Amino acid sequence: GLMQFTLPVRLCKEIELFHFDIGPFENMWPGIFVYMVHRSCGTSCFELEKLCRFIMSVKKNYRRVPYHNWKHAVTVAHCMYAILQNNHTLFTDLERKGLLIACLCHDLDHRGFSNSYLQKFDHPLAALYSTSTMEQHHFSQTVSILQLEGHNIFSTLSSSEYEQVLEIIRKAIIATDLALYFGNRKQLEEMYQTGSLNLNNQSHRDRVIGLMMTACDLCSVTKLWPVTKLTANDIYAEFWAEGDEMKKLGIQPIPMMDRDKKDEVPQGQLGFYNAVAIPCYTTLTQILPPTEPLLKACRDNLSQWEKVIRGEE
Numbered sequence: 001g002l003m004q005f006t007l008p009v010r011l012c013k014e015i016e017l018f019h020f021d022i023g024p025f026e027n028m029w030p031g032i033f034v035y036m037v038h039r040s041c042g043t044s045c046f047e048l049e050k051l052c053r054f055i056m057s058v059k060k061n062y063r064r065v066p067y068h069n070w071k072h073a074v075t076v077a078h079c080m081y082a083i084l085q086n087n088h089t090l091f092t093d094l095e096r097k098g099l100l101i102a103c104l105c106h107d108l109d110h111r112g113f114s115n116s117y118l119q120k121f122d123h124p125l126a127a128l129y130s131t132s133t134m135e136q137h138h139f140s141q142t143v144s145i146l147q148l149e150g151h152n153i154f155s156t157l158s159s160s161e162y163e164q165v166l167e168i169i170r171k172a173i174i175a176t177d178l179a180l181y182f183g184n185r186k187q188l189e190e191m192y193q194t195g196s197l198n199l200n201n202q203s204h205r206d207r208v209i210g211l212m213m214t215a216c217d218l219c220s221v222t223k224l225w226p227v228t229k230l231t232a233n234d235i236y237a238e239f240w241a242e243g244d245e246m247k248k249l250g251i252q253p254i255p256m257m258d259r260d261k262k263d264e265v266p267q268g269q270l271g272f273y274n275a276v277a278i279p280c281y282t283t284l285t286q287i288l289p290p291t292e293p294l295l296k297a298c299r300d301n302l303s304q305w306e307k308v309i310r311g312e313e
C-alpha cells in the first residue's frame with residue numbers, strides 16, 4: 001500500500017522525457033513499468049501482487065526475436081507513458097490504465113514475421129484471422145493471460161468498466177496494424193483541417209488513440225541517433241530473416257527484406273520517415289501539441305539518415 005517504486009536519480013529524471021531509453025538491464029524493466037503505472041494512474045488502480053504476476057506472464061510470452069521482443073513492449077509502453085503525462089487532463093482514469101497494458105501486450109507472442117509472410121506461408125493464424133493477423137492474435141494472447149488464476153489486474157473494475165477497458169485494449173492493439181494507419185491518419189488529418197474533430201465523439205477518440213498507438217509503436221525513430229541507429233539493425237535482422245523465408249517459398253522478396261540489397265537501407269529509411277513516421281508524428285502534434293518533441297526527434301533522425309547517404313557516415 002505505502003510501497004512506492006523509486007528509480008536512480010538519472011532514471012527518475014530521464015524517464016519523463018520522450019527519448020528515454022530503458023537501458024540494457026532486463027531485470028529493471030518491470031520496476032520501470034510499475035513506476036510508470038503508479039505515476040500515470042495512481043498506486044491504487046492495480047493490486048501490486050496481481051500486476052507483478054501479469055507483467056511476468058507477459059514477459060514469458062514474448063519470444064527471443066531481434067526486435068519484436070519484451071524490450072520493444074516496454075519501450076512502446078514508456079512512449080505511451082510520456083504522451084499520457086504530457087496530456088494529463090485529456091484522458092480518463094480507465095484509458096490511462098488500458099493503454100499502458102495495451103502497449104505492453106501489443107506484440108505478445110510475435111514470431112518476427114509480417115502478416116504478409118503468414119499469408120504466403122499459409123500459417124494457421126492466416127486462416128483464423130484474414131486481416132490484422134498477428135494483431136488479432138496479440139489481443140487474443142492478452143485476454144488469455146488476463147484469464148489466468150490471480151492475473152485479472154482489472155478484477156475491481158465494475159462489470160461495464162471491464163468491457164470498456166477490454167474494448168480500448170482491442171482497438172488499441174488492432175490499430176498497431178500499420179496497414180490501418182494510413183486510412184486512420186488521413187481521416188484524422190481531414191477532421192482537424194475541416195475542424196470537425198471532437199474528442200467527446202467516441203469514434204474520434206478511437207482514431208486519436210489509434211494514432212497514439214502507431215506513434216508509440218514507431219517511437220524508436222524518435223530516440224537519440226545512436227539508439228535509433230542500433231535499433232535499425234534489430235529491425236533489419238527480422239526483415240532479412242523474413243526475406244530468407246520468402247526465398248525459401250520461391251518468392252523474390254521486396255528489397256527492404258533482401259539481405260543482398262543491404263546497400264539500399266539508408267534510402268529505405270528515407271522512404272519510411274517520409275511516407276510513415278513524419279506524417280504520423282505531424283498529425284499527432286496537430287491533435288496533441290505537447291507531443292511535438294517526437295516530431296522534432298523524428299525530423300533530426302530523418303536528417304541523420306540523409307547524412308548516411310551523403311557518405312558523411
Ligand SMILES: CCCNC(=O)c1c(C(=O)OCC)cnn1C
Binds near residue numbers: 218219272
Ligand atoms: C515492422 C514495424 C514497422 N516499421 C518500423 O517499426 C520501423 C522501420 C521500417 O519499417 O523501415 C522500413 C524500410 C524503420 N524504423 N522502424 C521503427
Ligand SMILES: [Mg+2]
Binds near residue numbers: 106107134176
Ligand atoms: Mg505488431
Ligand SMILES: [Zn+2]
Binds near residue numbers: 076
Ligand atoms: Zn510493436
